[PDB]
């Protein structure tokens, strides 16, 4: 089953790129410190997984 | 004033439900194409075969008469 895998990488691939706005990690973003969320998002994003959903 | 990312007065709807378009073709009738499609595979066939079967014997014809 070769190819849905890929399919669904080049969305995966796009929320990779979302964490990386957010953070700046590919992956590994720490990002949630305790007490609450560290370093809150930048300006444009939202529509953005709004495009994505 | 305040800067942050709010939602702009609230988003539009969001999709989330399955579908299917189950074309079709009703596949009973799709039998009658299947068979459709094979008895005019065969009456061609048939034609084709008994033709060639008439020049068949044509070149029998040639040998029979050519052999003394």
Do not use: C
């Not at chain 2, 044509?58 to 050519?66: K, M, S, T, Y």
């Amino acid at each position: 089953a070769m190819t849905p895998f890929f399919w669904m990488f080049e969305e995966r691939e796009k929320m990779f790129e979302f964490y990386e706005r957010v953070s700046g990690a590919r992956m590994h973003a720490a990002y949630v410190r305790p007490g609450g969320v560290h370093q809150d998002l930048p300006l444009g994003l939202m529509d953005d997984i709004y495009e994505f959903s | 004033v305040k800067q942050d990312m709010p939602p702009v007065g609230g988003y539009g709807p969001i999709d989330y439900k399955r579908n299917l378009p189950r074309r079709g073709l009703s596949g009973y009738s799709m039998f009658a194409v299947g068979i459709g499609a094979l008895l005019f595979g065969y009456w061609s066939m048939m034609r084709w075969n008994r033709e060639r079967r008439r020049l068949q014997i044509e070149d029998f014809e040639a040998r029979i008469a050519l052999m003394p």
